[PDB]
């Protein structure tokens, strides 16, 4: 049995993307310090421990699953789209996610807020005419107070509906105070929607929408994600494990149940 690793993860021959201090999801949403991972691509994406977010406090229900769907796709290719928001202020941002001289937010998300006196009943629609699936990511904002809810969205309680021809997610914000994070007691909740060809993404809301800026091109799940603090070395090796590289010469390995590439069977 193969029962030992070099200790490092060899840079060759699989395109191994080290996230350094960004996890996938942070690099996905576009946390200011993962701006480097934009449009990046990989066979295997290793998430380190250092990893810390540092933008608007958010939570992703169905995290481990949205994470895996992206990880497999292996590309982070984002495609901007001409969304037309008429009636609200776009490009909103915050001090808990500074960028440049001040207030910032996730590069791949667009915070809409009221335009002066009002927040209209948004209802955009965006058809997928292409020959590939589209992975739209959006979110809902949950202010912690009826004051915040109304300063930003006017309406006393908002609602977000993101429908396609076969689905229908209607999440309604939930005002209340969550624990302080980077000075905030507020939160945003990340949702997703895959749109099949000849389908139409439809966003209708009248509050709290944290709109999509476009879509992520999705290829076929040949790639994979892995958490490991293993050093990366310049070397050729086929079987990668959280513990490092192990040779695929023996038929059974007992090093780890998680591996990448032509690997010995786990025992």
């Amino acid at each position, epitope marked *: 049995v193969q029962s030992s690793s070099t200790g490092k993860i060899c840079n060759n021959p699989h395109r191994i993307l080290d996230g350094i201090d960004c996890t996938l999801i942070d690099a996905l949403l576009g946390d200011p310090h993962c701006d480097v991972f934009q449009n990046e691509t990989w066979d295997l994406f290793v998430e380190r421990s250092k990893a810390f977010s540092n933008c608007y406090p958010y939570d992703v229900p169905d995290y481990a699953s949205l994470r895996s769907l992206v990880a497999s796709s292996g590309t982070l290719e984002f495609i901007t789209e001409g969304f037309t928001w008429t*009636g609200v*202020i776009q*490009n909103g941002g915050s*001090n808990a996610c500074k960028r440049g001289p001040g207030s910032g937010f996730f590069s791949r998300l667009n915070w809409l807020t009221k335009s*002066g*006196s009002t927040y209209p009943v948004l209802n955009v629609t965006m058809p997928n005419n292409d020959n590939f699936d589209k992975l739209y990511i959006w979110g809902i904002h949950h202010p912690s107070t009826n004051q915040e809810q109304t300063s930003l969205y006017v309406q006393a309680s908002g609602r977000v509906t993101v429908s396609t021809r076969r689905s229908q997610q209607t999440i309604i914000p939930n005002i209340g105070s969550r624990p302080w994070v980077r000075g905030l007691s507020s939160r945003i909740s990340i949702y997703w929607t895959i749109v099949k060809p000849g389908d139409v993404l439809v966003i209708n809301s009248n509050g709290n929408l944290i709109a999509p800026r476009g879509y992520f091109k999705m290829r076929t799940g040949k790639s994979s994600i892995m958490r490991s603090d293993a050093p990366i070395d310049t070397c050729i090796s086929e079987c990668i494990t959280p513990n490092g590289s192990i040779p695929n010469d023996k038929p059974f390995q007992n090093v780890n149940k998680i591996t990448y590439g032509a690997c010995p069977k786990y025992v």
Partner: antibody
Amino acid sequence: QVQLKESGPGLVAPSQSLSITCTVSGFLLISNGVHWVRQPPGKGLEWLGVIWAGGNTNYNSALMSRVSISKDNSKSQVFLKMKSLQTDDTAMYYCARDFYDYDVFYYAMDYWGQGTSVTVSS
Amino acid sequence: QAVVTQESALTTSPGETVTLTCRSSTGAVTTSNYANWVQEKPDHLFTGLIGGTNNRAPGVPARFSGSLIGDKAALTITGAQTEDEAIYFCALWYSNHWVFGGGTKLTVLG
């Protein structure tokens, strides 16, 4: 950096139509509103109106019947259009950027243009 | 909408601590008003100083402070310097409508 410039006529006769332009740079019109403030010679400042980032506008109750703010988001231009001009209208015309803080929730006029003088004389 | 009123002119000397004030015909100046304090320098070149009542704008020196003092809003230059001579305009928000004050002329006896 933020930057606002007003380009206008300079001299227009009473009963004609005043049309000033505020060319903003370093921020988008869909991200911020732009305000119009005028200062007649030896007087205080007067707020003319405002065009929000959503396009909707809010005008000064008084002058509202004659004013009209618009904007071309694609060109970065805010347009102040006044009709039925009368002498009183001689004043410095200013466009200033509308700012809103999302964490403390307050409005503010941060970036003031340079201004452009308009005399209404026959 | 309402009528913002403030000192015509105030004359201080270097060091003294002046306080310009901003009244509202319609009542007391609350936080709801977002008292804005614009500073007009020579040849009308305006500059923001304080926003939302007491948020000091970047360039503005530490010595400028925004606050409510009773039922009116105020700005306080602590240790006025000749370079503070200027017309200090007060602007008060009243439901998607701004209302400026008459402005105060500050002389700094030099």
